[PDB]
Every structure is written in structure tokens, then in C-alpha cells.
């Protein structure tokens, strides 16, 4: 999540880079599994900053 | 922990909406596709062809019938065969019994939508005739003299530009007209309109409009074989050149019609349609 | 300059070629005339066509329950009259140069609250249900009604409102107008720039590609009442940012519009 | 000091050429008189006229489906009299010291609803459509009108608002002032500083490159009712920041104004 | 995916408009023209100059004509033939008769809308004259004596500052005042305004406005030959000097006037114009 | 090009003024004067003094 | 799209760079052809990120 | 809380990292003291410029 | 104008620099000409992303 | 002026640095002066960028 509203305001679209012609793409054979980039959020963390927020300071 | 704000007030104009009458810019619409990311791709060979046909230059410079005149072999030396106003603006009514519907050419349909317009035009004519006819011909380009009736005199030939052509086998005569002015453009304007006349001279203020006439006159009498037709039917084309370009966009003045014209003409057009739709007749 | 076969090709002269001037100079140019006294530079129609302009005309909701129904990709043919009056834009004007186009379309409106002819009129406070039907199934056929214009108003039927397709809900007193963007969700990748000559598209047109499958719903969260309290609205249109003319073609007949 | 040639040619004088001081020092300055007592630094006249000033005079809209025509580029010949009363700005005061000028010109304006004189007003709670007509034919001839103001009012003709010319559509609202502007848009690109005597310019005054092709015009979304709503504006104007003034001439007699 | 909101709340302060009053900052029109993007270029040559015009300081320094005085054989010595004084504000009565119409030079325009003034003022004087004609002439510069009705006594001859000429074969004169004052500036007051008399004494504070008087004495009595005219008219001109700059720009006081001023001045008027416009005679 | 909108969607809190109470921060008036950049300088010897009179020491 | 939606933020205006004095400037001889920078969307990609999100993640 | 701030904008969002499976996660022993990073608000310094602003400048 | 209005942004003023003390500043003898460095307007280039923007893409 | 604005921007906060423990600050000796970093406006300056802005291009 944090890391999509990250990107969404560097490239102000949801759309990471620079496109590709549409006739020579293909992921007929790509199967998404539930681990990804996206599947672990932010706030589970313990680098000091963010224990500290965490405690409430 | 949730501080307190403490840093920059920013200041800002709210819009009802973003650059609805500009072209570039950004639109502010919601997309109702499930993807906030629509959007279609554009490539060469979509219709056809690789080039961009939306570009002006792509539809200024489709050649376009325009006019015919007559050239026989009664017309005497110094006969002006035809004279042509030199401007993008080509809208002139349908005929000389109908004037309130009107033909045009691909440079009329965008003139009849801009303020001003810069350029050269194409002059292309097509004899149609045999090789046993012979004439010589003067065509010319005479800048700032429009008629009798709102320029002063007549032209001096010796002080005129122009071509001396030399008809008996060719067939075809062109040439481009550049453009020529006091400004770095002119108006849109159709030649007839009344808001021209100044002092009961109808168009006498049309120099801020067209920029001259391209002149046909007859130097050489047209002389032809006895088994031939006497007269040659001659049809005028024009086109906009490399440079024809216009700047300021508007509403259109006249707008596409599809009604009728004449009783003639609607049994003409139904003839056809049958031929060009039918299943059997209709 | 005189031969018997001094014509140039159409393809060759849409590349540029053109015959010598009778001056005998070189054709050249720059972009002085442009900077020094009109600020810009104008090139093509895909520039012009963006320009927003009023789409429909005179439309109200005068009756209980009513709605807009709006079918944003439908030009109408010209008019057969010395006396046209309607909205004319320049998407409309230039599109009878060309044979085919594609890409989305744009929708605005402005809507206000009125008790009667002639009286006060206020901006809608309250929101507006905007809703697009895309499939050629139960709800779309409902919808269709071919001697109906590409702007009306009815009671939308039931097993529309409430199925649930794509929906956005504007707050004008927030938004100010209300702009939203139909996709060109098409069948393939070009339609054909046909045009109607009384209405609106019917399923034929639809399965035939000659229009992209699209029926455009706007509902107010009001009680409209014929008898005091009526909504006048108005409409406007352009084309997206993915939009294309292709293939020319030759000229219409023009005529003057009504002036009075 | 003396002698048979000690005048200064003009042309040299605009250069900084000046006589010795009848004190015999040079000439000097620096900056802290403005830093030290104003705050900023006053050095021409093209930061000068970019102020705002009312433009127009009693502007107001009281007959059915009624509209603001308005001329953005006209100035108006001087007073006659020892009472005058109408708007000053900081451009058409300056105006008089030269002979050309070119840019685009910006236009706001301010708007209230009132059920007539002396009694309540409210800012506007609808959306005013706003279009500008360049070109010379139909539409623009039909909005001329010599003996009106730079800021009329009247019943727009038909063959105009139907027609999609450049159409921003405003809602005060959320935007607070309308605030627009209009190109030079004009056929060379300079354009002699000409003046108006009795209200606005003909065809030939265009034709002439006399003043730009442009009327602007201001449409309400609301009824108006001579009886009992009208609505009242007020209209603002200054050139914009493409604007110049070229080629210094003499200066004109002044008068006092109405003081009362 | 379409996560959540979590980040920066800002602060805003919305506007009606932006920089209506100032000469800086940013403008938020919306755009008439097709581009959102419309502005003009702007060059050397534009109207014949590669200067800047609109710089105050190239309107400043226009010599302007102001006043005359006459110089006769019979001013004895120390006779005041003139006074002026020392300040932009260039702005006076038509004539003696009509005092509600003005006359006023490029400073006086500019003075007349703006609160604070700085710098030199340059004088020029031209001796209308023969070379038989021979006399000597004090000029000089007086800060803070204005006349003798609101300054103590007659300023000490001895203790100013100024330039004796013998104008016998010259003909001009010129020469630049400095500013001279307790503040870095002074105020944009014309002297006459009645606002500025104090105890029954006119103009009494305007010492707040004005840095005091040029004056031009008799140092020699004229003499002239027998066979030429015996009297001198002297022309006064003024402009700016390179340092002459204002501060608080404001509402001009007085405004254009296009109106009439005497029944002989309009009779010249329509004389020259006919002259200058007609076709035959109007 | 006019591209449609598909970027970050901010949040924003109005202010009818900012910091009125406050002696830091910024202010959110409109100048009169010509200069939306007008402000006068402050050095020493204005008054006759290198010393900040107003510091309450 | 993206790409200009992008470019329209960094320099706050459509214009992508610095003037060009307009007497030297020709574009007569060019000829814009469907396929440029501006003709291929972002949103037809491959990379990792792109295809995360593309499924809903 | 000046040094929060800034963060949130940043990365938009709290979250000041990466983030890190669950499963390998434990701050059991982790024992928080008053002393921290955020302890100490930036207003208490005698840098130059912040004197200057201290003293309304 | 393009160029002002990022130089606005940058340094959120249309100052553009340090600034230097009064006493010192002379621009007596400055005479402005009408060719400067925003006398050139933005839009006229023929750089390629500039070029296929005008033509609307 | 300008120079504050600037970096309320770039800190989101009138502080400019880190803070420092209070125990271990003193300002006793401290004696402001009238000329200081912020008592410079930064529109005094005669950069050719502006001087061109001052005189409207």
C-alpha cells in the first residue's frame, strides 16, 4: 500500500514505466501466486524509527 | 504519533473544470473503464496507411474540381476567358438560380472555420480538347487588382508576371501561386459577403481578403482542324500548396446540408442510389 | 509546366509535391507569422476536435423519476433545412471529411433547479448518479430507443439502476461541473463514421460495429415534480486524448444557418 | 554650459545624455531610497499597467435571455467635459503617450442576483458560459453594434451560441472570480493605438488591423425577469504578460474629474 | 490495486484571484485561444528601436517645451526675470482665464500618479536672439526659497550657488539640478494644491514637495544694437535626469481632456485639420 | 495532448487564515503594494544603534 | 499519457524545453507519421510491478 | 514532530520502510524508554539560523 | 513564461537569488532592450516530444 | 522572506534542524544585531534574470 502511493505520486499514474508494443507482449503462460511485491505491508517492521512511532512518540 | 501540522499553507484557485476550449493541457474527466488507465493505442496501418491524415496539409493538398470555362474559336485577341479570386475561401452557391445552398472544396471547408490564412495555391487546368486545335494562351497572377469595378483601370499586360502557353498537342498547364501581401497574413472572408462593400461597390474592401486574380487571356485566336468541335472545354482545379497554413479557429460560418436542390437533381440522385443499393430495384 | 501529363497523383500530392510557382522561386516559410501576431501554432484537426462544445439541446426533467440517457459516440446527419438551429461542434464539422475513427469520448454537464418557465433558477444541490451500460444484454436492450435522441429523458426501467455496472456519483457543489470519460470499449479496432438520420443507434448498429455498445445514464438524488419543481440541464462534448480521424474523403453541400 | 549648440537631440537624451550639474559632481544613486523607506522598486511602465482597474460602467442584465457582449480591446477617446465620471485604469492612461501596442488582454468579472434596486444581492449560484468570436463572417458581423460600449448588454442573435466557438465554461461557486483571456490573435503584429470616440469598432476598423478580431460574451445560466430578478456585474481588465507599448509621442491636455 | 489514503494533509487557503493589484507573480486566467499555451514573441525591431520604451526612464528624459520669459533693455540690474520650481510635477493652468485645463510635460504625467519622486531635473534655456544683442545673465539653483511670501527675507546673492553667462554671439544654455533634501525622497504634490497652505499663506508646505527655485537675474542690462528687435524671448525646456525615478504608484489625479478651451483655439484647430485631412477641403 | 487525469489524489484541510496567533510560520495576505515581493531591509544604525532594541533582555 | 501527464508536472506547462528564436524555425518539409514517443500507453508492460498490479495487488 | 512530518510526506504514509514477513517477527523482549528519536523536538537549537527566526527575524 | 512560472515554483517567489545590500547597488547607466531572456516563448521548438505534442498526440 | 518561505517548504516546519537536549543549551550571552541572515530582501539584486522580471518581461 505505502509502496503504491509512493509510486502513484513519482509517475502521477498507476503505471510503473514506459509502455511496450501491444503485438509482441504476451503472458499467456504467467500465473500470479499470493506472495508478491505488493503482498507484505509496511508497517511490519522493527528499524528503530519506526518502533518508536509505533509506541506512540 | 500524530503531530501537529506546522509547515507550508499553500495557495489555490479551484476549477469548476481544465482547458475545456485548448487543446493541450490536462482533463480533469472520471473515467467510467474499470481501468483508471485507459487508453488505446495508435500505430501505423490502423487504416490503411502510415501517415497522419488528420494533419491539415494531408487534406489542404487533395487536388479539388473547382471551375470550367469555355475557349472558342470566335474569341478574339486580349478575351478574358477567366478570372479566379486567389484565396483559400473556395464556397460559391450551387448554381446561379439556387444562392442560399453552396459548393465548396477542401480549402473552403476549413477556411469556412478560421480567421486568417498564409500560403500558396495550386492552379491546375485540363484542356479538353483533340491535336488539331492550336492557340496560344497568357495566364497570369496579378496581385492586388480584383474587377472593373473596384480597381482602377485595367492591368498593363507588360508589368504583369505570367506564362505563354503554346497549345496543340499538351493537354494540362500548372503552376503555384505564392502568397503575397503587406501582413504576414489575411482574412478568411468570402468574397461576396456584404459586409465588404464600402460605397455601394459590392466587395470593394476584399483586398484584406484575397490577395489578387490568376488571369487566362487569349493572345493567339484558336484555330481548329473542320472535323473537329470548335470549342474546348477547360476544367479548373486547385489545391493548397506546401506552405497553405490558417490560425485562428472558430465556429464554422455554413454547415453540411443534405436536403435537396432541384427536381432534376433528386431523380438523378434516386437513379443512382437504386443502381448503388439495390436487391433488385430499390 | 505544360505537357500532356501535368497532374499530380492525389497520394503524391498529400506528400507534399506541387507544381513549380509561376514566380519561379522556391516555396519556403517559418514560424514568424505564428510568434509575432498569433501566439501559436495550428497544424491538424486532432488538435481542433479537443475543443469542448454543447451537445443536445433544450433537455429537462419535467417528471417524476426521470433520468438523462445519453449516447455519448452518435453524430446525426446534417440538417435538410435553410433554418437549422441545432449545436453544432467542431468534432461534428470535421467529421465529415473522414471515413473511420476511434477512441473515447468525453461528456460535461451543468444542471440547475427551477419552479416553472421563466423563474430563478439554482445550481443542483445534491448529487448526480451517473451510470454506463456497455453489454448487448437485458439491461442495454432496455435501454435502446431508437426514435429517441442522443440526449433525452425517460424513467429508466427496472434491473438497470440497481445491477450495479460501472457507477460514479459527482457532488456538483464540490466538482462544479460534472466530467466523467467513456472508454472506446469496442468490438474491433475502427467504426465506421456512419451517421443517423433520425435518433439514436438500435441493436443492429450495435452488433454491426457501427457504434461502440455504450448508453450513458445521469440521475439526480432529487423528487422532480411537473407541477413546481423541474431540472434544466446542458451538455457538453469532445473527444479523448486517444482519438483519430482516418481515410479522407471528398466534401458535402454547406448552407447558411438560421440567423434571428 | 553656453554656446551656439548645447541643445540635446532627443534620440540622445533617451540615451542617458544629460548636461553637467550646475554643481559640477557627477550623478548617483543606489538602491536604499527604495530599500530603505518602500520595498520594492518602480522602474517602468510595462509593470504598471498589469494592475487591474473596473472596466465598463453599470453593467446589468434585466430583459429575458439577455447577455454581456464585451470588446477587450478598446479604449475609449478622453472626456469632453469638467465632470467626468466614467473608470480609469492604469493601462488606458498610459495609453496616451504611445502610438502601437500588441498582446492579449485579461477580462474578470464579478456577479450578484437582485429583485430590484435597493434591495439584497447574492453572488450568482449558477454557471456562466463564456465565448469569444475572431473570425469575420456570419457570427461576428451579426455581434456588431458601433454604438454600443465596450461592455453592452443584449439578446444574443441565433447563429451564434450554437455554433461551438472557443466556450470556457465558469462556476463562481468554487472559482470566485471569472477570470479569462484573450490572444492577440491579430493579422500582423503590431497595431496602432487608435481610440474610440463614440463606442465600439465597425468592420472596417477590423479589416483595418484597427483593433483584433475579438468579442467576448458572457451568458448566465439563469431566467432573467425584468419585473422582479436581475443581475448586476461588474467587469474588471488588464493587459497581459505578452503585452507592449512601442513609440513615444507628445503628450494631451488633462482636466480635473468630478469631485463629489 | 487501489489502496487507502495515509499520507500529508495540507494546508490550503483557497482564492477568488491572484495578483489582481500586482505587477508580478502569476495569473490564473482561463485561455480563450486553441492553446493553453498562447503568448507572443516579443524582439528587437518590433516598432523600428532595440530599446525598451516603457523603461521610465526613456520617457523621462524627452526634452519638454514648458515656459518663456521676456528679457528687455530696460530690467535693471537684479531684476528676477524668472523662477521655477525645482520638482516633476509639471502641471499648470491652460492659461490665466482658463484654470480648470491643464498643460503638463512627460514628468508631469508621470507625477501626477505616483506619491514619491528622486533625482535631477535638467533645464535648457533658449535666447531667441541676435548676435548684436549683449548682456550678463545669473542663473542659479536656490534649495528651500520658493517666493516672498513663504521663505524669511531675499536669499544672499553671495552664498548660492551659480553660473554667470555673457551671452553676446551664444544662444543656449543648459545645465542639471541634483536632488537636494533631509529625506531620500519627497512628495508628488502640485504646488499650487490649496491642501498645502498653512496660516492664510498659499503653497506655505510646500517645502515638503519641492526642494526649492531656479531663478535667472539680470547681472548687466541688456543692450542692443538701434537696428535690431530690443527684446529677448527666452524659451525654457525641461526632462528628467538620469537619476529622476517615483515610488507609489497609484490613481492619476487629473485625466486626458479632448474637449475645447476658447472660441479661437477651436477655429486654428479646424484650420490645421482641414489641411491635414481633407480630399479638397473638409 | 490533453491527457486525462489518473495521478494522486491529495488531502487538504482550508484555512479561512493561517497562524493568526502565532509569531512564525507564514501569512496568507494579499499586497497592495505593487510588488507581491515588497518588504523594506533591516540593518544596522537605522536608529542609531547595531542593537536589537526589541529583544526583551 | 502517463508520460505526459509526467512532463506537464516537472515544467509546469505542455512546453518541454527553452524557445527558439521563430524567424530561424521551418517544419515545412515534415510529415507526422501514427507511430511516435506519444502513440504506445504505459499501462502495456511486463515488469514485475506492473503485472502485481495489473491483478488487483 | 517537525522530523515526523517530514517523513509522512516523503513516503507518503507513516510507514518509514520496506516491509518484512510476520512470521520472522518478534520484539518480545523489546523494552521502549523515554529517550528516543522523536524525543527531542527541533525548535531547541542555537544554529545561526534558527536564532535569527527565534528572535521573529 | 514557462520558464517564470518553474523559477515561481522552485523557489516559491519570483525572486530568484541571494539578496545584496541596498547601499551598494547601482543600475544607473542599465538600459533595457526589448530581446531578452523571456522574450522567447516555450512552444516554438521543433524538438521531437514538442513537435508530436502539437500535432495533438 | 523568500529565503524563510523557501525552507517552511523543504523542513514542512519554521525549524530548520535537529533539536538538541535543553540541559546542555545556553543562549545567556547571546546579543542579536540588527543586520543578520533574514535581513536581506531578496529582490535587491541585479542578476540578469532579474532585472529582466523587474522591468515586466
Same mark, same amino acid.
Request: glycine letters at 6%.
Given at each position: 500500500? !505505502?509502496?503504491?502511493?509512493?509510486?502513484?505520486?513519482?509517475?502521477?499514474?498507476?503505471?510503473? !514505466?514506459?509502455?511496450?508494443?501491444?503485438?509482441?507482449?504476451?503472458?499467456?503462460?504467467?500465473?500470479?501466486?499470493?506472495?508478491?511485491?505488493?503482498?507484505?505491508?509496511?508497517?511490519?517492521?522493527?528499524? !528503530?524509527?519506526?518502533?518508536?512511532?509505533?509506541?506512540?512518540? | 504519533?500524530?503531530?501537529?501540522? &506546522?509547515?507550508?499553507?499553500?495557495?489555490?484557485?479551484?476549477?469548476? &473544470?481544465?482547458?475545456?476550449?485548448?487543446? @493541450?493541457?490536462?482533463?480533469?474527466?472520471?473515467?467510467?473503464?474499470?481501468?483508471?488507465?485507459?487508453?488505446?493505442?495508435?500505430?501505423?496501418?490502423?487504416?490503411?496507411?502510415?501517415? @497522419?491524415?488528420?494533419?491539415?496539409?494531408?487534406?489542404?493538398?487533395?487536388?479539388?474540381?473547382?471551375? #470550367?470555362?469555355?475557349?472558342?474559336?470566335?474569341?478574339?485577341?486580349?478575351?478574358?476567358?477567366?478570372?479566379?479570386?486567389?484565396?483559400?475561401?473556395?464556397?460559391?452557391?450551387?448554381?446561379?438560380?439556387?444562392?442560399?445552398?453552396?459548393?465548396?472544396?477542401?480549402?473552403?471547408?476549413?477556411?469556412?472555420?478560421?480567421?486568417?490564412?498564409?500560403?500558396?495555391?495550386?492552379?491546375?487546368?485540363?484542356?479538353?480538347?483533340?491535336?488539331?486545335?492550336?492557340?496560344?494562351?497568357?495566364?497570369?497572377?496579378?496581385?492586388?487588382?480584383?474587377?472593373?469595378?473596384?480597381?482602377?483601370?485595367?492591368?498593363?499586360?507588360?508589368?504583369?508576371?505570367?506564362?505563354?502557353?503554346?497549345? #496543340?498537342?499538351?493537354?494540362?498547364?500548372?503552376?503555384?501561386?505564392?502568397?503575397?501581401?503587406?501582413?504576414?497574413?489575411?482574412?478568411?472572408?468570402?468574397?461576396?459577403?456584404?459586409?465588404?462593400?464600402?460605397?455601394?461597390? @459590392?466587395?470593394?474592401?476584399?483586398?484584406?481578403?484575397?490577395?489578387?486574380?490568376?488571369?487566362?487571356?487569349?493572345?493567339?485566336?484558336?484555330?481548329?482542324? &473542320?472535323?473537329?468541335?470548335?470549342?474546348?472545354?477547360?476544367?479548373?482545379?486547385?489545391?493548397?500548396?506546401? @506552405?497553405?497554413?490558417?490560425?485562428?479557429?472558430?465556429?464554422? #460560418?455554413?454547415?453540411?446540408?443534405?436536403?435537396?436542390?432541384?427536381?432534376?437533381?433528386?431523380?438523378?440522385?434516386?437513379?443512382?442510389?437504386? &443502381?448503388?443499393?439495390?436487391?433488385?430495384?430499390? | 509546366?505544360?505537357?500532356?501529363?501535368?497532374?499530380?497523383?492525389?497520394?503524391?500530392?498529400?506528400?507534399?509535391?506541387?507544381?513549380?510557382?509561376?514566380?519561379?522561386?522556391?516555396?519556403?516559410?517559418?514560424?514568424?507569422?505564428?510568434?509575432?501576431?498569433?501566439?501559436?501554432?495550428?497544424?491538424?484537426?486532432?488538435?481542433?476536435?479537443?475543443?469542448?462544445?454543447?451537445?443536445?439541446?433544450?433537455?429537462?426533467?419535467?417528471?417524476?423519476?426521470?433520468?438523462?440517457?445519453?449516447?455519448?459516440?452518435?453524430?446525426?446527419?446534417?440538417?435538410?433545412?435553410?433554418?437549422?438551429?441545432?449545436?453544432?461542434?467542431?468534432?461534428?464539422?470535421?467529421?465529415?471529411?473522414?471515413?473511420?475513427?476511434?477512441?473515447?469520448?468525453?461528456?460535461?454537464?451543468?444542471?440547475?433547479?427551477?419552479?416553472?418557465?421563466?423563474?430563478?433558477?439554482?445550481?443542483?444541490?445534491?448529487?448526480?448518479?451517473?451510470?454506463?451500460?456497455?453489454?448487448?444484454?437485458?439491461?442495454?436492450?432496455?435501454?435502446?430507443?431508437?426514435?429517441?435522441?442522443?440526449?433525452?429523458?425517460?424513467?429508466?426501467?427496472?434491473?438497470?439502476?440497481?445491477?450495479?455496472?460501472?457507477?460514479?456519483?459527482?457532488?456538483?457543489?464540490?466538482?462544479?461541473?460534472?466530467?466523467?470519460?467513456?472508454?472506446?470499449?469496442?468490438?474491433?479496432?475502427?467504426?465506421?463514421?456512419?451517421?443517423?438520420?433520425?435518433?439514436?443507434?438500435?441493436?443492429?448498429?450495435?452488433?454491426?460495429?457501427?457504434?461502440?455498445?455504450?448508453?450513458?445514464?445521469?440521475?439526480?438524488?432529487?423528487?422532480?415534480?411537473?407541477?413546481?419543481?423541474?431540472?434544466?440541464?446542458?451538455?457538453?462534448?469532445?473527444?479523448?486524448?486517444?482519438?483519430?480521424?482516418?481515410?479522407?474523403?471528398?466534401?458535402?453541400?454547406?448552407?447558411?444557418?438560421?440567423?434571428?
Amino acid at each position: 500500500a !505505502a509502496s503504491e502511493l509512493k509510486q502513484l505520486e513519482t509517475n502521477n499514474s498507476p503505471s510503473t !514505466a514506459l509502455g511496450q508494443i501491444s503485438e509482441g507482449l504476451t503472458t499467456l503462460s504467467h500465473i500470479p501466486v499470493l506472495g508478491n511485491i505488493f503482498s507484505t505491508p509496511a508497517w511490519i517492521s522493527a528499524k !528503530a524509527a519506526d518502533l518508536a512511532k509505533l509506541f506512540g512518540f | 504519533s500524530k503531530p501537529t501540522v &506546522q509547515g507550508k499553507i499553500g495557495e489555490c484557485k479551484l476549477r469548476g &473544470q481544465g482547458r475545456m476550449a485548448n487543446f @493541450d493541457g490536462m482533463d480533469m474527466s472520471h473515467k467510467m473503464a474499470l481501468s483508471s488507465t485507459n487508453e488505446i493505442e495508435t500505430n501505423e496501418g490502423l487504416a490503411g496507411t502510415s501517415l @497522419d491524415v488528420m494533419d491539415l496539409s494531408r487534406v489542404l493538398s487533395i487536388p479539388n474540381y473547382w471551375d #470550367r470555362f469555355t475557349w472558342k474559336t470566335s474569341d478574339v485577341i486580349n478575351t478574358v476567358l477567366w478570372d479566379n479570386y486567389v484565396s483559400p475561401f473556395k464556397v460559391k452557391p450551387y448554381s446561379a438560380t439556387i444562392t442560399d445552398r453552396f459548393r465548396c472544396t477542401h480549402m473552403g471547408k476549413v477556411a469556412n472555420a478560421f480567421t486568417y490564412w498564409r500560403g500558396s495555391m495550386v492552379y491546375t487546368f485540363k484542356f479538353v480538347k483533340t491535336q488539331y486545335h492550336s492557340g496560344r494562351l497568357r495566364i497570369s497572377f496579378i496581385p492586388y487588382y480584383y474587377n472593373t469595378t473596384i480597381s482602377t483601370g485595367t492591368p498593363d499586360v507588360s508589368r504583369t508576371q505570367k506564362i505563354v502557353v503554346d497549345l #496543340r498537342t499538351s493537354t494540362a498547364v500548372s503552376f503555384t501561386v505564392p502568397y503575397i501581401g503587406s501582413r504576414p497574413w489575411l482574412y478568411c472572408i468570402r468574397p461576396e459577403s456584404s459586409w465588404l462593400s464600402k460605397d455601394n461597390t @459590392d466587395g470593394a474592401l476584399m483586398y484584406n481578403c484575397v490577395s489578387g486574380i490568376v488571369r487566362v487571356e487569349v493572345l493567339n485566336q484558336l484555330v481548329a482542324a &473542320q472535323n473537329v468541335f470548335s470549342e474546348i472545354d477547360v476544367i479548373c482545379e486547385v489545391n493548397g500548396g506546401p @506552405d497553405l497554413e490558417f490560425a485562428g479557429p472558430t465556429c464554422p #460560418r455554413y454547415v453540411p446540408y443534405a436536403g435537396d436542390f432541384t427536381l432534376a437533381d433528386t431523380r438523378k440522385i434516386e437513379a443512382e442510389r437504386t &443502381q448503388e443499393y439495390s436487391n433488385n430495384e430499390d | 509546366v505544360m505537357g500532356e501529363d501535368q497532374q499530380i497523383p492525389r497520394n503524391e500530392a498529400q506528400h507534399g509535391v506541387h507544381p513549380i510557382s509561376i514566380d519561379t522561386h522556391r516555396i519556403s516559410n517559418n514560424w514568424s507569422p505564428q510568434a509575432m501576431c498569433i501566439g501559436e501554432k495550428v497544424v491538424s484537426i486532432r488538435q481542433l476536435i479537443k475543443r469542448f462544445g454543447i451537445f443536445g439541446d433544450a433537455n429537462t426533467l419535467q417528471a417524476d423519476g426521470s433520468s438523462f440517457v445519453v449516447a455519448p459516440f452518435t453524430v446525426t446527419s446534417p440538417t435538410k433545412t435553410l433554418t437549422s438551429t441545432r449545436n453544432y461542434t467542431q468534432f461534428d464539422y470535421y467529421y465529415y471529411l473522414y471515413a473511420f475513427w476511434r477512441g473515447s469520448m468525453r461528456i460535461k454537464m451543468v444542471a440547475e433547479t427551477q419552479d416553472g418557465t421563466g423563474t430563478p433558477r439554482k445550481k443542483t444541490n445534491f448529487t448526480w448518479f451517473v451510470r454506463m451500460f456497455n453489454s448487448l444484454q437485458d439491461s442495454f436492450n432496455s435501454l435502446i430507443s431508437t426514435s429517441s435522441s442522443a440526449v433525452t429523458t425517460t424513467v429508466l426501467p427496472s434491473g438497470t439502476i440497481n445491477m450495479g455496472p460501472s457507477t460514479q456519483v459527482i457532488d456538483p457543489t464540490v466538482e462544479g461541473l460534472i466530467e466523467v470519460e467513456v472508454p472506446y470499449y469496442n468490438i474491433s479496432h475502427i467504426t465506421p463514421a456512419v451517421t443517423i438520420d433520425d435518433g439514436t443507434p438500435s441493436m443492429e448498429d450495435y452488433l454491426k460495429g457501427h457504434s461502440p455498445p455504450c448508453l450513458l445514464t445521469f440521475s439526480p438524488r432529487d423528487s422532480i415534480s411537473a407541477t413546481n419543481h423541474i431540472i434544466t440541464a446542458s451538455f457538453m462534448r469532445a473527444l479523448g486524448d486517444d482519438f483519430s480521424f482516418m481515410y479522407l474523403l471528398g466534401v458535402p453541400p454547406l448552407v447558411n444557418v438560421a440567423r434571428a
